Specification:
homodimer; 55 residues; elongated; cell cycle (chain B); Cell division topological specificity factor (chain B)
């Protein structure tokens, strides 16, 4: 009933981004207001994984 | 040394979104503020948009 988008943020388990999850955040703000997706799943794999589903 | 961070924006070939640019532009832009890197690389290969960033 609908197509889907996926943003995967990848990096090394080595780094310490004292601002990672915020980047993990603001970035989303950029996809929802442009894709208008109500449905979103973020989970970790280090590799954050955000799957969007559109309207 | 050599700290690689990379974003992948997966999409369908079908699905239009005549703007995988700005979507990108904004994601990139953000990224360029939080990591402040000046070494940015984006290749493009069920469409899959990758982007390597090596922070300073």
């Amino acid at each position: 009933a609908t197509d889907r988008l996926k943003l995967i943020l990848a990096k090394e388990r080595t780094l310490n981004l004292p601002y990672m999850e915020e980047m993990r955040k603001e970035i989303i703000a950029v996809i929802q207001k442009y894709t208008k997706s109500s449905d979103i799943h973020f989970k970790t794999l280090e590799t954050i994984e955000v799957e969007i589903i559109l309207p």
